[PDB]
């Protein structure tokens, strides 16, 4: 079997999808502009019907950890070299594919960004940055990006995480793991369902990993409060036979002086490590990871820094934007609190 739901575009379907994305890139100024954010869900209705059928059905299935779409053509010559930093990563060559990702994302829910991550951008970049190979963020390389729920600290975290591979010549794998329900005993399961765990915000929300001012953007103050004074939360929620998962390998901890909770988390680490599997996003592959069913990461790899490094576009998706209205910065689609 495959733990994800997979769809392969025919050449005609992919060509049509790309043509629609090119139309949007031609007509709109940017993906994150208020105009295209509103229209993308409606424009996405013009995508190939077999893809729309897959996205509507696969989303409502109970089992898959991700929805994978293969076969989007990407011309390395037209794309150009991989950017050295995310700041300067909105290149004309990558523009149509950013619009394509937002169109696909529009079929699954409401796209949003974070005020404290990559300058409040909705469409974000994942690429290796020179100097930061051994960091705990997505711009790492030599150090493996440990498994985690995206923005695990926040209750306004995405339901789905979209990942479109612009290039990945050496086939570096995205890691994935579901809830290890076949190995979790009921006592450990009970404890994971209780609010006895501290999940702090990851390093992508730090001020150093955003541009120069930016800080002091008031939304960083809420990140500091989440890091300094994290309130206890549960790792598992909902149905015991198919729980939703909320955990971060490098930023989770038990409640202070709670050894029962600690033992449960320690056991969960072991079981997730042992059941971790690989998903290689080849050039043109799009993956929408179910952020509630699965944790994800990225394998360690040797960065090139020759202009052809692994490069993904990424986007956060929620099924309901009004869930996070407390975290609304303003009228924009950028979340964060004081």
Ligand X SMILES: N=C(N)NCC[C@H](O)[C@H](N)C(=O)O
The verdict on whether residue 256 carries a ligand-binding annotation is no
148 marked among binding-site residues:
yes
Rounded to whole angstroms, the Cα distance separating 89 from 92 reads 9
Backbone angles phi, psi at 242, to 5 degrees: -155, 70
- Flag whether 250 is marked binding: yes
Whole-number Å distance between alpha carbons of 229 and 233: 12
Query: Which of residues 65, 148, 157, 293 is near ligand X by CB under 6 A?
Result: 148
Q: Is 204 one of the binding residues for ligand X (CB under 6 A)?
A: yes
33 carries a ligand binding annotation: no
The interface partner of residue 110, options being Fe ion, a second copy, ligand X, none and the CB cut-off 5 to 8 Å by kind, is a second copy
Rounded least distance, CB 255 to a second copy, Å: 20
Q: At closest approach, how far in Å is the CB of 41 from a second copy?
A: 5
Q: Per the annotation, does 125 bind a ligand? A: no
Does the protein bind Fe ion through residue 150 (CB under 5 A)? yes
Q: How far apart are the C-alpha atoms of 167 and 308, rounded to whole Å?
A: 8
Was 248 annotated as part of a binding site? Answer: yes
State the CB neighbour count (10 A cutoff) for residue 180.
Answer: 16
User: Residue 250 or 320: which CB sits closer to ligand X?
Assistant: 250
Stretch that binds ligand X, among 30-38, 57-65, 145-153, 191-199 (CB under 6 A): 145-153
SS (H, E, C) 310-334: CEEEEEEEECCHHHHHHHECCCCCE
User: If binding is defined by CB under 6 A, does position 202 make contact with ligand X?
Assistant: yes
For 178, list phi and psi in degrees, rounded to 5: -90, -170
Nearer to a second copy, 3 or 73 (CB): 3
Q: Are 210 and 117 in contact (CB under 8 A)?
A: yes
CB of 103 to ligand X, least distance (A): 22
Q: What does the block give as tokens for 156? A: 């306004």
202 binds, among a second copy, ligand X, Fe ion, none (CB under 5 to 8 A by kind): ligand X
Closest contact distance (angstroms) between CB of 169 and a second copy is 36
Q: Which is nearer to ligand X, 116 or 188 (CB)?
A: 116
On whether the CB atoms of residues 336 and 151 are closer than 8 A, the answer is no
**What angle is formed at CA 36 by the lines to CA 111 and CA 159, rounded to 5 degrees?**
10
Query: Helix, strand, coil shares of the chain as percentages rounded to 5?
Result: 35, 20, 45
Give Cβ neighbours of residue 75 (< 8 Å, ≥ 6 apart): none
- Annotated ligand binding at 137? The verdict is yes
Residue 254: CB atoms within 10 Å: 19
Minimum CB–partner distance for residue 118 and ligand X (Å): 8
Q: Is 151 annotated as a binding residue?
A: no
Q: Is 248 in the site for ligand X (CB under 6 A)?
A: yes
- By CB under 6 A, residue 290 contacts ligand X: no
- At residue 96, φ and ψ (nearest 5 deg) are -60, -35
The binding site for L-arginine consists of 136-138, 248-250, 314
Binding residues for Fe ion (CB under 5 A): 150
The binding site consists of 136-138, 148, 150, 174, 248-250, 296, 310, 314
């Amino acid at each position: 079997v495959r733990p994800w739901s997979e769809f392969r575009l025919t050449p005609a379907e992919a060509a049509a999808a790309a043509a629609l994305a090119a139309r949007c890139a031609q007509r709109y100024d940017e993906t994150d502009g208020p105009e295209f954010l509103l229209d993308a869900p409606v424009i996405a209705h013009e995508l190939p019907r077999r893809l729309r059928t897959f996205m509507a059905r696969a989303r409502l299935d109970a089992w898959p950890h991700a929805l994978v779409v293969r076969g989007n053509p990407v011309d390395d010559a037209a794309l150009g070299s991989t950017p050295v930093h995310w700041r300067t990563a909105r290149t004309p060559g990558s523009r149509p594919l950013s619009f394509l990702l937002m169109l696909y994302a529009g079929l699954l829910g409401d796209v949003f960004g974070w005020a404290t991550q990559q300058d409040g951008r909705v469409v974000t970049d994942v690429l290796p940055i020179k100097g930061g190979e051994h960091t705990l963020v997505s711009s790492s390389s030599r150090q493996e990006l440990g498994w985690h729920t995206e923005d695990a600290f926040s209750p306004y975290r995405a339901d789905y995480v979209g990942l479109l591979s612009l290039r990945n010549p050496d086939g570096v794998a995205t890691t994935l793991a579901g809830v290890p329900l076949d190995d979790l005993d009921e006592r450990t399961l009970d404890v994971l369902f209780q609010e006895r765990f501290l999940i702090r915000p990851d390093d992508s929300h730090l001020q150093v990993n955003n541009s120069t001012a930016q800080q002091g953007r008031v939304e960083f103050e809420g990140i500091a409060q989440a890091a300094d004074r994290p309130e206890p939360v549960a790792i598992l929620t909902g149905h015991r036979a198919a729980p939703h998962l909320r955990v971060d390998g490098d930023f989770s901890a038990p409640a202070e002086g709670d050894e029962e909770a600690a033992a449960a988390l320690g056991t969960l680490r072991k079981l997730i490590d042992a059941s971790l599997y690989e998903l290689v996003l080849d050039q043109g592959d799009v993956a929408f990871i179910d952020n509630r069913r699965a944790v994800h990461g990225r394998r360690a790899f040797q960065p090139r820094y020759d202009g052809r490094d692994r490069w993904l576009k990424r986007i956060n998706i929620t099924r309901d934007l009004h869930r996070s209205r407390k975290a609304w910065a303003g009228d924009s689609r950028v979340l964060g609190q004081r």
